[model samples]
Target chain A: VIRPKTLGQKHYVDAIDTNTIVFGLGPAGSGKTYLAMAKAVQALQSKQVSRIILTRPAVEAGEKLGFLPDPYLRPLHDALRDMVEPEVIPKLMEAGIVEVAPLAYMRGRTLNDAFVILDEAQNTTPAQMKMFLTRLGFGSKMVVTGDSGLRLVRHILRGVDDVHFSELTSSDVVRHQLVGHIVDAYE
Target chain B: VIRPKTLGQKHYVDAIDTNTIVFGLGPAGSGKTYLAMAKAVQALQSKQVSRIILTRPAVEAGEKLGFLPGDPYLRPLHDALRDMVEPEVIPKLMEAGIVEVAPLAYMRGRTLNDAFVILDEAQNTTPAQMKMFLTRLGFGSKMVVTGDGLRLVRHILRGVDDVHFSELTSSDVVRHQLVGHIVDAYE
Candidate 1:
């Protein structure tokens, strides 16, 4: 077994302390989305929010899954299994928490008094982003996470990065050695 | 003589494979700001951004110096030394001839070309404050802003912690352990 290192805490703490919402933006390995999930779990255990809702726009599949031979759930399930579910529930399950439906099923519900996490967000379009943000009910908190570079939709309005960053520059990024390397090696 | 680790070629390779501004977002102990600083320094050393502008909004603490403080630059100089300088990375940038200090107020007049900017203590900014900072982005300049959402400006009803529910969410936090513990301990 590997020794445990002390990870950063500001993102989770800041996420827990607020009411409106929290957004964590960064590259692939910096832990923006997981911290959001951890905060949601903490809120659930602490009873800050009652239920949890996890949703994403399904933009990554190119909205052309009609070409797939199997039913819609077939392709969607494959993608979510590959990208989303690993963020939440599993860790909570490790700590004896409940496992719920994946993010695709959050369609017709008004989530009140719940802690929700929207992962794989860069795949969403502008309209999808608006729809997801407006779904928040009272006494609830939401966390949205995505990598802008992974935007699944083409020719949409500004990507989620533009939408959020145009409105927020003070948003903190949880960092590590790997994070710096990613920024440098890429840019 | 602290030895912080480095990200090797693997991370750099993937970064080049992706598109978008890679950000490191999280809390203080998570190294979100410090690592961003390191990346900026590295980029400047390698001629990534031509200059560096380090900025943050000043949360007004109730200490007015009335009229006569020493020279005009005295208080500002002292504030720069004590408040603006980051203990971890600013000195390195200054020594390398890549960094210059600009208060959040003075950013409006000038254009930042080919500069790498680091905005620290972002959790203290309001949404409007964050927006104002981002509009100053000039061509060929990259920006990295860091803050802990838990620590917000007292007068601002809602702060950076509130953005999680919308489009800015990311999954990068799960890649490391330091982010989780730092956030968990805050509660």
Candidate 2:
């Protein structure tokens, strides 16, 4: 239902055609996660990929996992749901387009013929991020979404720090009208 | 000189008229600080206010004032100046007269008069600190609060976790934009 326009559609299609590991980084409201999720759903329906793996690092400022009633997977799912709910998945599920998965469950498994999204990737440690990257097997595509400037942990030895400056840039292409201004304004 | 477009001019004029504590909040890279600085410059050039006070809590993740070698006064001045530099302050300073101050020590005794005040990085300030900074706005001064939702740092006396959510959602105006597809397209 979220069919992109000429440029948007081209960008979406090209992403599927060309890139193996696509990273989306920018200020908030820039459709980084939303558009990726949409594309993943589209790819699934078109049979480009088999399943969807949605994940992020289990990082917070100070709140402990025990403080929350649910287990680790629940909170992780809660965060992903917060990002995709009312935006990409609810409608997609109605149309049977895609499904979500917890990141930890992704370990020890080789993902193939699937679309994986690592949302809020800034929170992931470097080792964890590397592990996630290596987990991508044949016939898999991944999109990583993060804002480097906004890290959950202080100097959390995350891959975001290593790749933030090089892999991501201001050129990640902002979609929303006020996203650029807002991002430029906030910092 | 960043001239206010029709919309910018209208918003600035309306804020001037309403005597409202305008809050501009968004993620990093949004134009919150830059626009607020620009608005203050405009007010100063137009003689709407006499002076300007720029303040924010000097919160860094791991670095502390003692760890960095410099005058305590110079620390804030440098920090504020660094913020101004990246957030497009040099041009505004060239275009209009301005003044910048730290949040902690200097503000206690002085009464800002006929000033266009900007509170940058307010999310770092404690509720009491926020109140103290806000109360510094003397007669004929307009206040603009700017902060990043992701940048709050907690302290022993006033932890970033203690920040009131009321402060976060109190923004009267919200502006956003989309990321262009070219920058986001990894292919």
Candidate 3:
């Protein structure tokens, strides 16, 4: 029942469906992560992926989770909370059917039979990105989300076979064109 | 007679009326200086001031044009003044000293009295220049400083009583909550 609110998002969702590996390059909060999460949830429900693996970096949480047992992966659960039933998240995480971690946790592990999303890849170092992309397994789908200026990674992955990138800018912020200008201003 | 395009502009104009000195700190195109000009028009209409004086600098005009027809810095002020008042009368008004638009160079060692004076692109003015410009305020006169900053202005002037800095963001630019996130990212 989830629908994209703007043309950029609809195309982004379409790319996710057709491409085994898709990169959504809009600035953060441009529905890049949320729509990708929704697609992951859809794949999970349709038996397309056996599990969901979501990872972002450690910067945003910033050691503020002293009272909690975790950080960084915290917001993913909030997105998951919105799509899946709110209370069912604890059970889902407990069974490892849906896993969330910091990007560093992604090392040395193949993401098999899962919908794997590396959110905010702008924070990823070159070697780290190579490690994460190489870990993509057969029967797995991977989505990478980051800002538009990710030419550091872009120069490498842009021409590699059938991989697809869906780009969004301020004009695609269907919620308000003004917000798009804000995004453009910073960029 | 001029109306604010956004809440920030409305409050900005409101601040101009109540405070003898106000700063409109928003990126260009946020209607900061436009609405300030509107207020200046209002003041002229109400006889609150005998004249309107507008000043920004030539640096942004991109013209090293002291040797040529150097009305570059003042043209935007006229464009704004035309919107606030009749275009036909402006020539006569300027001729009579009822309205004037000059480069920041025009005001040296003089207190501006019984006038509404606005400094656009105030960020381009040196901090020392700002100190001098701010000191030009005279009894019964009001001034507004607009720009997209030196950290010094906020650090020093922020705590001063009766001086208000009204900040507008991309949200104020005829658009959104989304743009706000974009603006925040760049900021």
Candidate 4:
């Protein structure tokens, strides 16, 4: 079973189960997108969701370059490969049980009975964030994860009724210990 | 210019300037060792210190296999040194005795002077081991001790005197952002 190592990560995982719309905000290494992916996979395997929709912005932020087919959605593909069986991933994609695409592609679809994850949400414009949030349909759970410094989005998200907003921090970062220090230095 | 990328890292840099005994504690990729090296270089370049002493326990921490010729434990420290020091100057620095890289066993009973000393992978050390290293500090010398969490040494470190202990979290990580998420999943 996938387990969260930090308290912040545990909280994010718990929120996924109890909240219809969850926003995970934190610095880069605070387990925001990774935990969301784990929850998405768990839901899919348990038959809670028939499909998984993974989306992220097309920006580069210390991700390994040129390793995946689509640069924008490469982080999702990388996370999926780690969590799902290799052979099953191709089958899932081919059958449309798992969909990986950019945030722009999420513009015109209503995702129902699915686990939707929007990674790198910090890059989304306010208008883009609104559009993606409105696409959530019945029987669907949505997770939007990005940098916590996105105050405008957080303010707007706070006003939304019944939405779960969770914040992760440097302490929650589970990467190499040096990563936490690096983030701290920048601040 | 060498700039810190995270708040935790900034604190580390700041502590180096203000404190004699600085402890950089956190997980890998949190920039503990890397930033320590950067500050060491900066101090040396500014003539604040005349020498740099780099040492680490000769233990393995998932570093690359068989890239350099030395003790298996010493390769990781050497690799970090090469990354921070310029290519041509490293050999010269070593030859001049201005830069000393050795296993922790070699650090006993020596008074360090006008040097910036770094101890890496310090989590592997025991209480007696750390005490000897701490006593080696001399006038005009600075000490930076870095480790991922010291499952073994954390308790002992708490009782030390006048040491500047700083912690870095995942948000301080400057590696691939996904690395932080991956670390979260395991935790």
Candidate 3 chain A: worst-modelled 10 consecutive residues by lDDT: A176-185
Shift in Å, residue A101, candidate 4: 0.2
Off by over 4 Å in 2: A1-13, A61-97, A148-187, B1-187
Please compute DockQ, using alpha carbons, for every candidate against the native two-chain complex: 0.01, 0.02, 0.01, 0.02
Collision pairs in model 3 = A170-A180, A178-B175, A179-B178, A179-B179
**lDDT of candidate 1 over A1-187, digit per residue (tens):** 1111223335344544653565555554344554555566567768887665555554444445433321322222222222233344345445534334445456566778877767666766565665666777888877777663324332243343322221122234333223243333223
Off by over 4 Å in 4: A60-69, A148-150, A176-187, B1-187
Give one digit per residue, the lDDT tens place, for model 3 in B1-187.
4567778878888888788778898976788888888888889889887678899866663546465422655677788777878889888777655677877766653456577889888877777677767766655778888888345776666656557889999777764468769989999
* lDDT, candidate 4, A1-187, per-residue tens: 4478899888888888889999998976567887798889989999999999998776546645443545365446645744676446777988999999877788788999999988878776787788898999999999998873357777866777658889999788654333233333323
Tens digit per residue, CA lDDT, model 1, B46-99: 876656666766563344544431123223432443333465765554444346
True contacts kept of each: 0.00, 0.00, 0.00, 0.00
Give the alpha carbon lDDT tens digit for every residue of B1-187 in model 2. Answer: 4433435444544554464356655555445566667667667668786446676565643555654321452344344444435557644542332454544434542334466777766666666565555544444567777776323322221212212211222133333333435545844
Worst 10 residues of 2 chain B by lDDT: B157-166
Tell me the TM-score of each prediction against the true structure. 0.32, 0.36, 0.45, 0.46
Off by over 4 Å in 3: A60-71, A176-187, B1-187
Task: Give the candidate order by descending TM-score.
Answer: 4, 3, 2, 1
Residue-wise C-alpha lDDT for candidate 4, range B113-185, written one tens digit per residue: 5779999889877766776676666557789988873543445444444457889987787787687699799
